Assembly symmetry: D2
Homo-oligomer: 257 residues x 4
Amino acid sequence: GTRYAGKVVVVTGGGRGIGAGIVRAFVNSGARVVICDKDESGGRALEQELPGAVFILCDVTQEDDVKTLVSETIRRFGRLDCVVNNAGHHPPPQRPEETSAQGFRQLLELNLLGTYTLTKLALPYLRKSQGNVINISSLVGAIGQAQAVPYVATKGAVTAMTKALALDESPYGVRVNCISPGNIWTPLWEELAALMPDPRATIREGMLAQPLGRMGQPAEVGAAAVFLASEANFCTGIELLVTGGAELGYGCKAPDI
Amino acid sequence: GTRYAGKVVVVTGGGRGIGAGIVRAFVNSGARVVICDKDESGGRALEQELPGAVFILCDVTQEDDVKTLVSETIRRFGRLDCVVNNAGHHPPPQRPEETSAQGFRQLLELNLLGTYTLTKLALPYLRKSQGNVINISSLVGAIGQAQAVPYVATKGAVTAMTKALALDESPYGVRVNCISPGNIWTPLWEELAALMPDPRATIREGMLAQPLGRMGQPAEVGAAAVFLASEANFCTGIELLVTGGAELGYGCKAPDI
Amino acid sequence: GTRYAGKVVVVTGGGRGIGAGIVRAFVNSGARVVICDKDESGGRALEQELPGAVFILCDVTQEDDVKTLVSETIRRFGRLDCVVNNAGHHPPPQRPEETSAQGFRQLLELNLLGTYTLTKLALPYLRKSQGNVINISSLVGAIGQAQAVPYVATKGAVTAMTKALALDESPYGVRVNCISPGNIWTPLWEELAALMPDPRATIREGMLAQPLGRMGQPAEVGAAAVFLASEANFCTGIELLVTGGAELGYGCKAPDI
Amino acid sequence: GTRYAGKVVVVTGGGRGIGAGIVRAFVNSGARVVICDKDESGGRALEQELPGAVFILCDVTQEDDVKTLVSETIRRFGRLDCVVNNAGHHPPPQRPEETSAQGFRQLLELNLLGTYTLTKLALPYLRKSQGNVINISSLVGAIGQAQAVPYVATKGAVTAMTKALALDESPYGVRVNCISPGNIWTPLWEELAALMPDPRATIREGMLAQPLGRMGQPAEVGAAAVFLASEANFCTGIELLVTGGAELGYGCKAPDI
Ligand SMILES: NC(=O)c1ccc[n+]([C@@H]2O[C@H](COP(=O)([O-])OP(=O)(O)OC[C@H]3O[C@@H](n4cnc5c(N)ncnc54)[C@H](O)[C@@H]3O)[C@@H](O)[C@H]2O)c1
Ligand SMILES: NC(=O)c1ccc[n+]([C@@H]2O[C@H](COP(=O)([O-])OP(=O)(O)OC[C@H]3O[C@@H](n4cnc5c(N)ncnc54)[C@H](O)[C@@H]3O)[C@@H](O)[C@H]2O)c1
Ligand SMILES: NC(=O)c1ccc[n+]([C@@H]2O[C@H](COP(=O)([O-])OP(=O)(O)OC[C@H]3O[C@@H](n4cnc5c(N)ncnc54)[C@H](O)[C@@H]3O)[C@@H](O)[C@H]2O)c1
Ligand SMILES: NC(=O)c1ccc[n+]([C@@H]2O[C@H](COP(=O)([O-])OP(=O)(O)OC[C@H]3O[C@@H](n4cnc5c(N)ncnc54)[C@H](O)[C@@H]3O)[C@@H](O)[C@H]2O)c1
Ligand SMILES: N#Cc1ccc2ccc(C(=O)c3ccc(F)c(O)c3)nc2c1
Ligand SMILES: N#Cc1ccc2ccc(C(=O)c3ccc(F)c(O)c3)nc2c1
Ligand SMILES: N#Cc1ccc2ccc(C(=O)c3ccc(F)c(O)c3)nc2c1
Ligand SMILES: N#Cc1ccc2ccc(C(=O)c3ccc(F)c(O)c3)nc2c1
Ligand SMILES: OC[C@H]1O[C@@H](O)[C@H](O)[C@@H](O)[C@@H]1O
Ligand SMILES: OC[C@H]1O[C@@H](O)[C@H](O)[C@@H](O)[C@@H]1O
Ligand SMILES: OC[C@H]1O[C@@H](O)[C@H](O)[C@@H](O)[C@@H]1O
Ligand SMILES: OC[C@H]1O[C@@H](O)[C@H](O)[C@@H](O)[C@@H]1O
Ligand code: NA
Ligand code: NA
Ligand code: NA
Ligand code: NA
């Protein structure tokens, strides 16, 4: 309850799923948390539920929303120590020829540029606090995924951008790290599975993609984020995998001709 | 002179630098090459110089330019076997707070979406020929670079997109690979060094970043591309490093406090 | 003080350096710790200093020493939850032609087989407790190091072995992870620097190999180990980098000929 | 037929499987090849079959066999340009508790120390010729494999050792690279499958582990080796994957509890 006491954290997309788990983990560590989300429903309830968390409506694709997010965080709490860029989206499965440049641009706006924009506006305050940035990327940025060319590209960009910024901000004492989750059971996962011909089979396949035989939880991503913020002072530019071992070994991906 | 005989290759940004080296390597392997560039000067001269190479003016950020590139390749040569997405740019060094979202969007248009667009328009023909895609990414997509947040992000995206598309196109027999060059001596490298306070010192530093003690040549990237196209039939989704060992070992990147 | 309460941890090479930092981190988390070392001096003093830590003399290259370590841990504390395979050595810098097969075999005995042996003897008890294995590998297993062929090979083996065992033990609920430290200021680092022509310059170079501009501390490796043991329940087979960013960007490792 | 003309290559374990494919690829490139194997049957026939290849009986675990291999290569051909350390073995599947330290030591002797020993004895001649080293590692050194702790550890060591030696030999102009094959259809693969309850199902699973839906061929590893030797002059310390994409995407490796 004291690992991150006295600290102020902003979590984007904090109203449900992984983001809500991260919010909860930081509140439990003693921090004050600003929940950012484009939708009011989940985050407003989370603000009522958690002493030490407040909700600010903010679409991270809208630069003036993000400017107000940062200025309101400072006005209300007087410092900023950690930014968790969690807001993002995975479209339904799309064959490459079914994608469009414009859809790709829109997904880049959320998954990549929204992270870039908040980080930029927050860095002056993070320098004052020797704070840190945590980006929520994805395992599939590293290893690929089927029927997800735009999504995979955005997460490859987030992971690489994390390393670049880590280099640039290291002289100023600001660490920049990312978490690459694998299959985490969230409302996004449940929504995507419901789109498939056999949602139960899709979910079972999702569980069995991990050697641990289950999907991960938001709380587990949250514990990884609290570690990076509060106890990883010699870590910068790392990609912390929270995947249950999905990247390990051979599996079903499809004699020598 | 016969490793890729009878094959048709498109090389974007083929008018100078790495792209020209790739053009030359494919012509020497027996292929017919379409040189795509937004600038006429280098590519037009290369077309006169090399029997088996022709030049098509095409800005890969303009979808109708790229549509015409593909349709003219098929009209003139009757097949398409390999697309080398080499066109790209590295801006001058920029501190993160000196970057802009709009500049980031523009660099994404060239380095990422231009590759995406040509690949998309070319894939129907590559499926017919069991052809392949070669994307020119960068080592710094994997390991980061200082004062280059947007550039690094675009190349992280290219490398990840390569793996995603490799997965999607594997059922159709189309391989998708990338090359990640390190410091290659090109007109871009020379132009960027000339911007620095001490260009000669910047170049010397660039050479010494490699254990091999020199920068690479376009011809060396070209040989890697010809290998991927012509002789790497069990390789898909790989990142072939052409870096002189820059990613190896400890160096100068800046007792326990 | 309660994150790992009620748990029993064995730390090999726990008498000084990183191992002692790991011991301290686990005691501070509420665990009981068995300090294993081949030398009595540091570990015996640590046992007197820390309530909740005890010292067992044990050379991890001697299978009967390790058998007794495990049986005495169970006899004295009634369970085993985590094994931290930290014992290891870095020889003085050695040109490849100055190495020998026999010296390589001896270093494999310590850095690789000692880890293998304790893990094997401990796994039956870790299965009962749904415990976990933490191996201390090295960044240079991943990226290489100059004048250290045998050492680098042993750490490449530890990192790979971690992933293999993670796969094998995942059905039994036992997680297997590693930490790859970079330059950590320890008595080993101080001893090796003292061998060099200019020890102060060697140390300064060591600090500047990290973007953060300093070396790491044992306490920082220790916090990473406590995270892996106590809060990383969806992590198995990962390599957690504790390197200060040394693997990021271009540096000094040595125009195109 | 001229890419590696006038060059002399040693291939260990060259009598069958991948090694024989590598032998054939180098002969077809114009090189003279010394086939090293501990068994006479395959390599002696290959020597009769291929003008430009000769067979030398040599067990790479026996240092005096390897000394004679190098001295006989120089005596008979007057130079040495490339060493391909292909000899190695994969034991039958073994649960971790079914392995032994002594079995692990023996596998290290072949898969790791045999490579080390030939490389050491060959490096003085490779320096004279600005030659290169190609080690045959494995994809599972990078990503792990089930029921293969010792094997995986040996290949993690080979890949890491490749990078270390690349660093050490770069000042002398000697490049050191590795190839990490995935599932390649060889007599070893056929022998291991025959041990399983349902060999045909094991083989079908092996094919489907690759997005390309087949296993690789020795000839494909061979083409990768010829590229590294003859045309990859700016590549050192790389791991060239010849895996058919097995490392890409999610598969079958085994809702959030
Ligand atoms: N669930 C997984 O398996 C998984 C795996 C890897 C990575 N991820 C990443 O984790 C993050 C969270 O994923 P999730 O599964 O919890 O998703 P989710 O859809 O359950 O929750 C995402 C939250 O972000 C909010 N959000 C979306 N667009 C926003 C915007 N423009 N501005 C502000 N908030 C916005 C949503 O309203 C929602 O509350 C994303 O970056 C996703 O790419 C998820
Ligand atoms: N030079 C290096 O050290 C280096 C290192 C890693 C990666 N790369 C990558 O290699 C590729 C080539 O780099 P280079 O150094 O040869 O650069 P360069 O600037 O010397 O040549 C690039 C060529 O692409 C053309 N081009 C630019 N924008 C274009 C567009 N919109 N449409 C069509 N053609 C366009 C240019 O006119 C030029 O002919 C780029 O993707 C770059 O990111 C270069
Ligand atoms: N210090 C660094 O920069 C660094 C970097 C990366 C990895 N590592 C790894 O971290 C680990 C600890 O390194 P360190 O710097 O603290 O070293 P250290 O030499 O300071 O401490 C090592 C401890 O292990 C003990 N030990 C050695 N051989 C043993 C054996 N046979 N049985 C039992 N105990 C034995 C020693 O007595 C000593 O107490 C090693 O695995 C090392 O390879 C260290
Ligand atoms: N087949 C695969 O799927 C695969 C995958 C990844 C890596 N590999 C690696 O490729 C290499 C070749 O594998 P393969 O499948 O062709 O095996 P193989 O068993 O078919 O052929 C290996 C050859 O090496 C020889 N050899 C074995 N021990 C030797 C020794 N002590 N001295 C000299 N020669 C010796 C054998 O006699 C045989 O001719 C090995 O290093 C293996 O680990 C194979
Ligand atoms: N085809 C398909 C499919 C079906 C259901 C899914 C459910 C969830 C996800 C998803 O959002 C996801 C899954 C894994 C990731 F690493 C990641 O970043 C995102 N992907 C799915 C992909
Ligand atoms: N600061 C700086 C700086 C100075 C000169 C440079 C000259 C060239 C490059 C460059 O374009 C480059 C360098 C290395 C790369 F891997 C890459 O993709 C691009 N980067 C430079 C970066
Ligand atoms: N040459 C050299 C040199 C000089 C001093 C050193 C001091 C410490 C170390 C060392 O033990 C080390 C350094 C970094 C590592 F990642 C690692 O696993 C071990 N390596 C050194 C290497
Ligand atoms: N269980 C099991 C199993 C069954 C049949 C196999 C047949 C071949 C191999 C094998 O030798 C191998 C397979 C893949 C590799 F990357 C590698 O280095 C080696 N592994 C197998 C593993
Ligand atoms: O909808 C799937 C899951 O989403 C998670 O974010 C919630 O914490 C769970 O209660 C829910 O089961
Ligand atoms: O301008 C730097 C270099 O660019 C390369 O692309 C050209 O092939 C070289 O002739 C030139 O030295
Ligand atoms: O000897 C170098 C360092 O070793 C560390 O393990 C100790 O905790 C420090 O007190 C000491 O400065
Ligand atoms: O035994 C499996 C395969 O081994 C390969 O090395 C041979 O070239 C093939 O002819 C054979 O089918
Ligand atoms: Na509240
Ligand atoms: Na022409
Ligand atoms: Na005590
Ligand atoms: Na012959």
